[PDB]
Amino acid sequence: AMKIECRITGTLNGVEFELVGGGEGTPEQGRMTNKMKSTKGALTFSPYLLSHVMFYHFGTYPSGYENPFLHAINNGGYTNTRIEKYEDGGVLHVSFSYRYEAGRVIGDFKVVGTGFPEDSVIFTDKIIRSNATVEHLHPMGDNVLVGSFARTFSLRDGGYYSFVVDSHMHFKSAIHPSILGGPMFAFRRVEELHSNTELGIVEYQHAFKTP
Amino acid sequence: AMKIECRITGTLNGVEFELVGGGEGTPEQGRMTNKMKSTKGALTFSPYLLSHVMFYHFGTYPSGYENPFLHAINGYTNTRIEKYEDGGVLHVSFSYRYEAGRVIGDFKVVGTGFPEDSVIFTDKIIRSNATVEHLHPMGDNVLVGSFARTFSLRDGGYYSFVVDSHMHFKSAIHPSILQNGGPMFAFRRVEELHSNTELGIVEYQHAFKTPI
């Protein structure tokens, strides 16, 4: 298992937050872990908001295909920048940066969250989980993969809090020879163990062309 | 196989179009066909743009799980906002009638903001590619959908768009999917047989919660 180091720094409605930690991931089973502690006391918002923020390297890819994020570690790497629009008007701008220190992945993530109303679900602890997603991935050129997924949280009362994410993965040294005759799909799910101060995920990622 | 009747009207940058026809659908196979002909001469834009416009009824759903083809009825509307990478926008509304063991659709599209050098007026789209839509409920009466989609181009590139859908159900009309712990995903793909004047699709629709 590759060791994971992670730091997330950011602002939510102007309110600063930061957390640090890490874990382990193994690309072979498409599973990773990550546990991180806040460095600034209890979060002002639902810790579940950050599950999909707290490593695409650790996804399984179908038989004749190689995980292009896993592949890029050995050649220039890649960045990910996402724009996440939430149903109550909230918006997350998230940027993902990586450095690699011999069989260990280091994440430095920045998030900027704006426009969540005072009565937003994220300030209320009603989120009990996040649900699974299937991201649609396609290249726009040799160096860029464009992603799109909708995602939901289940609420304590039974309802849903939803968002939509548009991602731009900018690679340094050309993406793996798949590239390129249609999209790839990435199924993801998490197991979450959060307090307002200490967050934990188990994430599974499996890419496919056909289900 | 249940019979399908279909009409599609609207405008692309003001230019009026109308297509009429139909086909057949077998919900247990998750397969349907549809053949339609333009009534206003040859289209001013790629016929491939209409593939995902020319019937969710004909989708397989996993071990019950039913498919809201439940209607029956009593049915649903679909409204989609499709945003294209060129700046083009398609506004599409889907209406259905059920007269006698067959499904009849009357679909309306408004296309705007497609630039003069847009792919859609060029003939370079050779096919449309597969999708997986994410479906989740909004309060018993509304199903919200999201999918990105691509057309493959003759030069080997891509022309892409994203779609946000709102499915309004008349009389709930979700049991197995309302009480679901999360989203449903619907995998779709097509085979296209288009001429610019006469359009043909074979569509496959298969829903799932996992994997695959």
The CA distance from B164 to A166, in Å, is 13
Chain A residues in contact with B144 by the CB 8 A cut-off are 150, 162
The CA distance from B77 to B24, in Å, is 20
The CA distance from A153 to A45, in Å, is 14
A45 and A19 Cβ atoms separated by less than 8 Å? no
A206:B211 CB<8 A: yes
Determination technique used: X-ray
The CA distance from A17 to A53, in Å, is 13
Nearest CA of chain A to the CA of B176: how many Å? 14
B114 and B86 Cβ atoms separated by less than 8 Å? yes
Residue type, B40: K
Nearest alpha carbon to residue A169 among A58, A85, A57: A57
Output the CA–CA distances (angstroms, integers) from residue A6 to A181, B163, B175, in the order listed.
34, 33, 42
- Respond yes or no on whether the N-terminal peptide bond of residue B212 is cis (omega within 30° of 0): yes
Residue with tokens 């029956």: B72
Nearest alpha carbon to residue A183 among B54, B191, B160: B160
The torsion region of residue A51 among left (phi > 0), alpha (psi -120 to 50) and beta comes to: alpha
The CA distance from B78 to B186, in Å, is 15
Output the CA–CA distances (angstroms, integers) from residue B175 to A139, B65, B154, in the order listed.
38, 8, 44
Q: A163 at the B interface (CB within 8 A)?
A: no
A173 and A179 Cβ atoms separated by less than 8 Å? no
Residue contacts between A and B (CB atoms, under 8 Å): 86
Resolution to 1 decimal place, in Å: 2.1
Burial class of residue B116 (count of CB atoms within 10 Å of its CB; 0-12, 13-18, 19+): exposed
Q: A204 at the B interface (CB within 8 A)?
A: no
B4 and B29 Cβ atoms separated by less than 8 Å? no
Across the strands, what pairs with A4?
A23, A105
What residues have CB less than 8 Å from A155, skipping those under 6 apart?
Answer: A121, A126, A127, A128, A161
- Which residue range forms the structural domain that includes residue B165? 1-212
For chain B, the domain total comes to: 1
Pair type for strands B102-112 and B2-12: parallel
DSSP letter, residue B60: B
Output the CA–CA distances (angstroms, integers) from residue A184 to A25, A68, A137, A152, A210, in the order listed.
21, 11, 5, 21, 9
A11 and A36 Cβ atoms separated by less than 8 Å? no
Chain B residues in contact with A136 by the CB 8 A cut-off are 131-132, 147-149
Output the CA–CA distances (angstroms, integers) from residue A38 to A21, A42, A98, A128, B121, in the order listed.
9, 7, 20, 20, 53
The CA distance from B29 to B134, in Å, is 21
User: Which DSSP helix (H) or strand (E) runs through A70?
Assistant: helix A68-72
B205 and B52 Cβ atoms separated by less than 8 Å? no
Which of B129, B185, B208 lies nearest to residue A183, judging by beta carbons? B129
Residue with tokens 């060029």: B122
Across the strands, what pairs with B110?
B11, B91
Nearest alpha carbon to residue A194 among A112, A105, A103, A129: A129
Which of B149, B152, B211 lies nearest to residue A181, judging by beta carbons? B152
Nearest CA of chain B to the CA of A62: how many Å? 10
The CA distance from A18 to A38, in Å, is 6
The torsion region of residue A171 among left (phi > 0), alpha (psi -120 to 50) and beta comes to: beta
**Token digits of residue B142:** 């509304």
Nearest alpha carbon to residue B161 among B46, B76, B6: B46
Cα B118 to its chain centre, rounded Å, is: 21
β strands within chain B, DSSP E:
2-12, 15-26, 31-38, 76-84, 89-98, 102-112, 125-128, 131-138, 142-153, 158-169, 184-192, 198-208
The CA distance from B161 to B150, in Å, is 6
Burial class of residue B28 (count of CB atoms within 10 Å of its CB; 0-12, 13-18, 19+): exposed
User: Which DSSP helix (H) or strand (E) runs through A71?
Assistant: helix A68-72
DSSP tally for chain A: helices H, then strands E: 1, 12
How many other CB atoms are found less than 10 A from the CB of residue B155? Answer: 8
The torsion region of residue B43 among left (phi > 0), alpha (psi -120 to 50) and beta comes to: beta
Output the CA–CA distances (angstroms, integers) from residue A171 to A73, A75, A88, A96, in the order listed.
10, 9, 32, 12
The CA distance from A131 to A153, in Å, is 6
CATH of the domain at B85: 2.40.155.10
